Design a protein around this ligand. Sequence first.
Ligand code: 1J6
Length: 293
Amino acid sequence: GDIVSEKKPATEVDPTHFEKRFLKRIRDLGEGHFGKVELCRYDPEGDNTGEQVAVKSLKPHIADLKKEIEILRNLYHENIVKYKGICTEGIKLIMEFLPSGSLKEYLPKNKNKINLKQQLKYAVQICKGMDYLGSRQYVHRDLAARNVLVESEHQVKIGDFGLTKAIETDKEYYTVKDDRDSPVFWYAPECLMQSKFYIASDVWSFGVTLHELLTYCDSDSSPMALFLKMIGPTHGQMTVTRLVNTLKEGKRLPCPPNCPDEVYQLMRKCWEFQPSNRTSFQNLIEGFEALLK
Ligand SMILES: C[C@@H](O)c1nc2cnc3[nH]ccc3c2n1[C@H]1CC[C@H](CC#N)CC1
């Protein structure tokens, strides 16, 4: 008799689903090698009132971004950037937008407001985020100031997980294959030499990130700048080897100006050449807390 259609089942609204047609690009926020993040307004009413979100997509790998999304989705911590959702057909990760941006952007513009005490609190907060990540059996592999987002003058959050990887149960490390675009000047020796990644490797990276925090992410003070000073800036493809050598010799980044030795000693506990000799995120927390009392 009559044209048979399907009975429409009552459609809910998934608050973690962002319709592409309503996601309006405002501007670029930053990139990785294969990923990029844009500021957008999710503006379903079309009057520029919608919330601002950070949208992560692939540069023209889908499986790695899906993995990153599964990681972020199930991380619940105040020092971890918030998952808001996804936008699907292909996929985009939707996160909270932090207007102060990363430490690289915020620190140089707010030096006057940010004293050693606030920096130690950030450092504490970065350790708590990382420790949490470590308890989820993840290694981050990209801990640097550019990935530490400023929520407020009193709060930072780890704001990217493009390189994050689970470590198998009953295993101490993750062996990486693709290492082309490694942040070598943030990387522990075991990473630079054997492509192995421990939680301890992230402790090393934190030391370098802490050093960035302490130099207010000044570009002329970056671990890359300073390292290319110690080893030479014109070794091309021998750079990494020259790096591993220097580190073998016991050379590390120098103490930041106006950084008390006691803070610098916690930093150097991070840069123990052997992973088993490095401090842990919880000991760093205890250390920093000690300095704040
Ligand atoms: C300015 C830039 O550092 C920045 N501002 C942000 C505000 N909210 C955000 N939410 C998620 C990222 C993010 C933000 N990012 C960058 C953080 C690192 C990221 C690295 C990659 N890909 C690129 C965006």
